[model samples]
Target: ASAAVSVSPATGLADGATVTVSASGFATSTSATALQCAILADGRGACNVAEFHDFSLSGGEGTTSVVVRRSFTGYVMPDGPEVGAVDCDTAPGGCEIVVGGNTGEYGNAAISFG
Candidate 1:
């Protein structure tokens, strides 16, 4: 089953600052997959890489938080994160998630740099 994930304290943060992302009810798999964090660049309609995780596991059926470090310095207002699929060869179950219209959750916060 797919879990519902959310980002708390959803607000702007400075570049190089670390933020916590929460994932809940993730499906259990032997070999975990990498979680990707991307942020849109202005009106590009596409997101630039903000962060990525090589391994993640579900804690049964509860809320779990992962710390992500935002390293981009060019981020600004109206920016948000979008979760993407991991590399197929590196993902568990040999299947990588896809990115498309209205797919995955977007971060409720903007990338702040001051």
Candidate 2:
């Protein structure tokens, strides 16, 4: 099975929307460095700090929420350079909710903000 993610209120993603994220089939690693949840900067692999949150997995399944902030002006980084969730939201390709821990573990869901 493929790793995947889905979000509620899929449309009308305006700023500050507290959206719920439901995920499944995503790779998991409980080591100290494992990432619970995040919104990657557009197409890049770095996590958007503003939306960075934790997930509780139940056998490769998990859920979380993020308050979409269209005006977020902060660094989006962990293992890479910095970017902003705001830029990701405005990017032509749109934003995405990504889940993962270490490299090679991940899932994604596309989202566009108003």
Candidate 3:
């Protein structure tokens, strides 16, 4: 089985609007890494100007969704490399681009729409 994370309000997002989504079993890794967030669309992914705690996972299978609010200084279509691979250090917004770590042992990534 593949593990993944996703966000909501895929469209019509206003500047400084809060973005909310869920990550199933996202907090099970105990590795030392920073949590990254990005937006993906049309086979392209763009980094967001937002990141959370640089803490390790507590342990066990934990499924939780977090709500993050992003201020829209500019709007662009999601594109480019994997959301996690975007260089956070050189991105426009500090949180605009983020670095990601191993979500889990399994290497499965998925994004869904309805």
Candidate 4:
């Protein structure tokens, strides 16, 4: 099975709320990147590299978090994180919290930011 992802307070999210994202069913000792992707194009979509985080699995599990903000304007100013750090709000659909990387594997989960 692929990696399973879940988020706490899975409903009724507010801006600046910290939600814990937990991933399981991974291969042990494997590493991954935890990022939020919106617009969802090319499978990866517009990702916020500024909010990028990394994790390692132990016993097939790892954890990460995100500060959900509706006003997040990441990587748009001078000398920003990368060329495409998105706001996660400019998408037609809501953003996804992903735990992915390495061997082109990805774990997708839906998260809302008010």
Candidate 5:
């Protein structure tokens, strides 16, 4: 089955704001899958950000709903940082929670920093 994700309070927030990240449309039957909630770049290429919480997912039955809490800190350079989080993932294939919606690939809901 295909997978989908979502984040609450889509936009408009100050630094150090908490958001709820949820995912659904995953396979059932208790199969474990690699999942993570991280900040990704939009058009500007890989943000190289890794300020997220990684966790494992196992299907519930028909469709699975995975939820986690994350805080958003404005992006910063490698040496200079705002939230003290570093640019961990340098690879192009960074982790993203793609939920299906009008928002396109990255899903409808999004979080912003002030």
Candidate 6:
């Protein structure tokens, strides 16, 4: 089934900020599902995937949260006029922090560099 997801401190984040991605409305007693996080210049498409923040969840899925620290230290930042040479900054509109499950379930929130 689909999951209801959310992100904490959904805006005004700076580099090295800690964000929490949470999910609910999942199947109970289900096996662990892979979860991934990405920082996109825009709101969609492929971008910088946070391999260090990727995780798995299960155990009677009620609700779960993954804590990730924003950083460009070891991540391959996306290239474009929208992203520039920073990790947390975004385009004119803003950047999106996306969290998703391997099964195509996902959620996202917006954040801007300070």
Q: Count the backbone clashes (under 3 Å) in each candidate.
A: 0, 0, 9, 0, 1, 1
For candidate 3, write residues 6-42 as lDDT tens digits.
5555456444545454344544455433234344334
Cα lDDT tens digits for candidate 6, 3-74:
565666766655555555556655532333323334444444334444334435554342344444553333
What TM-score does candidate 6 get on C-alpha atoms? 0.49
The regions of model 4 sitting more than 4 angstroms off are 40-44, 74-90, 112-114
Best candidate (score: TM-score): 4
From the highest lDDT down, the ranking of the candidates is 4, 2, 6, 5, 3, 1
lDDT of 4 by residue, 48-68 (tens): 545776655666676766676
Ranking by TM-score: 4, 2, 6, 5, 1, 3
What is the Cα-based TM-score of model 1? 0.35
Candidate 6 lDDT at 91 equals 33
Q: Give stretches of model 2 more than 4 Å off.
A: 26-47, 55-60, 76-86
Q: State the displacement of the C-alpha of residue 108, model 5, in Å, after optimal TM-score superposition.
A: 6.3
TM-score per candidate, chains pooled: 0.35, 0.59, 0.34, 0.68, 0.36, 0.49
- Candidate 2 C-alpha lDDT tens digits along 1-114: 455556678776665567776665543454112232334434444444444555455666656655765555555445555443445444455555555665456665665544
Q: Across residues 1-114, which tens digit of lDDT does each residue of candidate 5 receive? A: 255554666566553455555556543323333233444454332232444333354443222344333333334455553543433244244335433322222343433433
Against the true structure, candidate 5 reaches a TM-score of 0.36
As for candidate 3, its clashing pairs are 16-71, 16-72, 44-79, 45-79, 48-95, 48-96, 49-95, 49-96, 50-95
Overall local distance difference test of candidate 5 = 0.41
Top model by lDDT, which number?
4
Q: Which stretches of candidate 6 lie over 4 Å from their true place?
A: 27-46, 49-51, 60-90
Which prediction has more favorable lDDT, 1 or 3?
3
